[PDB]
């Protein structure tokens, strides 16, 4: 019965939830810079994921306790009537940690909450994480952070998506937002509803790698390329085809 | 004129080289077990990559010096007339290291040799690494190792492919070979020449995740699932369509 073109089942009543944890400022005693532009990212993401049928829930500058609570909440709610789950971090990070407002959180513990064992409603459905996180270096300027967050995998049917890989650099325009998120969102706009999601993420890798970094306003920001990646542990093709909502309840 | 279905150019004279570093035994003072079965893997890989047009070059139980030499050799030869480059490690590993016969080698330094800067002939062409490596635990039995090798990325136009992810377990049958390699090679056989390579690797993730581990001859090998992954830094679709000659 084995099928090389098998797709994830994306015919549930609702598409599912897209969390967006958005971090602009941090507690003084962490000594991390403002991520001026992260709001463009949040809004651009919010729009593109909405037009794909996600209930988008944004959360600005949560402390560790608040963040762990809101994400544990979402893991224990039923996704039984949902196609998939998306979770997005716009912050600083280091190694296997993302930064909340007040301290770092182990990424494995956030993905761990949606592992088949602990969230039955999502077993066999895609769990996509998107992570725009790097090291805080210290009108519209382009700021550049060094890659810092390990490009971890997660578990069966997870897709981990990363702004930048080891040895490369992450770019954020202070008005237009992160290079990764701009190009992710451009591709979501044009191709989200037709293309297989990893096919799309590959276009994002081209779009971002192709961005030139030879003629730069800061002389020290020259020759710092951005190459994003993704770690697929998906088992099927993933498409976000428009859902039929013609005389149906999808709330 | 940006194109969402853009493919890597796979119309060069030759397909390219597939290295296979194959490690069965290790120096006494490392205390790592025989990988009985790794020869099935090597032969199965050799066949499937040959039928796709690769010049396959296997190397059995090289010491660190020998391995670094053979792979530096290959990085400095011209691949100008080649579609891509494949490199395969069948060994033990830990963190960001693969085991040669006599000591561990930093994976970044092996991938580093094919980074655009250092190997011009391969810039903009896919560089695929496939890594069947885990922690040596100590007729046809199924042996089970804990995942140990970090699922690293590499650079523009690299595809890093991994037998197993953090928290999961890697299986090798002592005659039939590694679960990952069996299912990789089955899929290469059936679909290698038609399917996009990441589409294929995804089938391998299904095939291997689906392998049941509830009714096992060893009671202690029960409930140890295998989930492989891949870290794509590819920028285009990758197909191994039959070359005309
Ligand atoms: O993927 C894994 C597999 C395992 F078996 C064990 C652990 C990991 C996660 N580690 C990483 N993953 C990707 C890039 C870097 C790391 C890294 C570097 O240092 C510490 N971690």
Curated annotation (Swiss-Prot), chain A:
<dbReference type="GO" id="GO:0006915">
    <property type="term" value="P:apoptotic process"/>
</dbReference>
<feature type="active site">
    <location>
        <position position="134"/>
    </location>
</feature>
<dbReference type="GO" id="GO:0008234">
    <property type="term" value="F:cysteine-type peptidase activity"/>
</dbReference>
<keyword id="KW-0068">Autocatalytic cleavage</keyword>
<feature type="modified residue" description="Phosphoserine">
    <location>
        <position position="50"/>
    </location>
</feature>
<dbReference type="InterPro" id="IPR002138">
    <property type="entry name" value="Pept_C14_p10"/>
</dbReference>
<dbReference type="GO" id="GO:0030855">
    <property type="term" value="P:epithelial cell differentiation"/>
</dbReference>
<dbReference type="GO" id="GO:0043065">
    <property type="term" value="P:positive regulation of apoptotic process"/>
</dbReference>
<dbReference type="GO" id="GO:0097284">
    <property type="term" value="P:hepatocyte apoptotic process"/>
</dbReference>
<dbReference type="GO" id="GO:0060545">
    <property type="term" value="P:positive regulation of necroptotic process"/>
</dbReference>
<dbReference type="GO" id="GO:0072734">
    <property type="term" value="P:cellular response to staurosporine"/>
</dbReference>
<feature type="active site">
    <location>
        <position position="92"/>
    </location>
</feature>
<feature type="lipid moiety-binding region" description="S-palmitoyl cysteine">
    <location>
        <position position="216"/>
    </location>
</feature>
<dbReference type="InterPro" id="IPR015917">
    <property type="entry name" value="Pept_C14A"/>
</dbReference>
<comment type="function">
    <text>Cysteine protease that plays essential roles in programmed cell death, axonal degeneration, development and innate immunity. Acts as a non-canonical executioner caspase during apoptosis: localizes in the nucleus and cleaves the nuclear structural protein NUMA1 and lamin A/LMNA thereby inducing nuclear shrinkage and fragmentation. Lamin-A/LMNA cleavage is required for chromatin condensation and nuclear disassembly during apoptotic execution.</text>
</comment>
<comment type="similarity">
    <text>Belongs to the peptidase C14A family.</text>
</comment>
<feature type="region of interest" description="130's region">
    <location>
        <begin position="96"/>
        <end position="113"/>
    </location>
</feature>
<dbReference type="GO" id="GO:0004197">
    <property type="term" value="F:cysteine-type endopeptidase activity"/>
</dbReference>
<protein>
    <recommendedName>
        <fullName>Caspase-6</fullName>
        <ecNumber>3.4.22.59</ecNumber>
    </recommendedName>
</protein>
<dbReference type="GO" id="GO:0043525">
    <property type="term" value="P:positive regulation of neuron apoptotic process"/>
</dbReference>
<dbReference type="GO" id="GO:0005737">
    <property type="term" value="C:cytoplasm"/>
</dbReference>
<keyword id="KW-0645">Protease</keyword>
<feature type="modified residue" description="Phosphoserine; by NUAK1 and AMPK">
    <location>
        <position position="209"/>
    </location>
</feature>
<keyword id="KW-0788">Thiol protease</keyword>
<keyword id="KW-0053">Apoptosis</keyword>
<keyword id="KW-0449">Lipoprotein</keyword>
<keyword id="KW-0963">Cytoplasm</keyword>
<comment type="function">
    <text>(Microbial infection) Proteolytically cleaves the N protein of coronaviruses such as MERS-CoV and SARS-CoV. The cleavage of MERS-CoV N-protein leads to two fragments and modulates coronavirus replication by regulating IFN signaling. The two fragments produced by the cleavage interact with IRF3 inhibiting its nuclear translocation after activation and reduce the expression of IFNB and IFN-stimulated genes. The same mechanism seems to be used by other coronaviruses such as SARS-CoV and SARS-CoV-2 to enhance their replication.</text>
</comment>
<dbReference type="Pfam" id="PF00656">
    <property type="entry name" value="Peptidase_C14"/>
</dbReference>
<comment type="subunit">
    <text>Heterotetramer that consists of two anti-parallel arranged heterodimers, each one formed by a 18 kDa (p18) and a 11 kDa (p11) subunits. Interacts with BIRC6/bruce. Interacts with RIPK3.</text>
</comment>
<dbReference type="InterPro" id="IPR033139">
    <property type="entry name" value="Caspase_cys_AS"/>
</dbReference>
<dbReference type="GO" id="GO:0043067">
    <property type="term" value="P:regulation of programmed cell death"/>
</dbReference>
<dbReference type="GO" id="GO:0002218">
    <property type="term" value="P:activation of innate immune response"/>
</dbReference>
<dbReference type="GO" id="GO:0005829">
    <property type="term" value="C:cytosol"/>
</dbReference>
<keyword id="KW-0597">Phosphoprotein</keyword>
<keyword id="KW-0564">Palmitate</keyword>
<dbReference type="GO" id="GO:0016540">
    <property type="term" value="P:protein autoprocessing"/>
</dbReference>
<dbReference type="GO" id="GO:0042802">
    <property type="term" value="F:identical protein binding"/>
</dbReference>
<dbReference type="GO" id="GO:0006508">
    <property type="term" value="P:proteolysis"/>
</dbReference>
<feature type="region of interest" description="Tri-arginine exosite">
    <location>
        <begin position="13"/>
        <end position="15"/>
    </location>
</feature>
<dbReference type="GO" id="GO:0070269">
    <property type="term" value="P:pyroptotic inflammatory response"/>
</dbReference>
<dbReference type="InterPro" id="IPR011600">
    <property type="entry name" value="Pept_C14_caspase"/>
</dbReference>
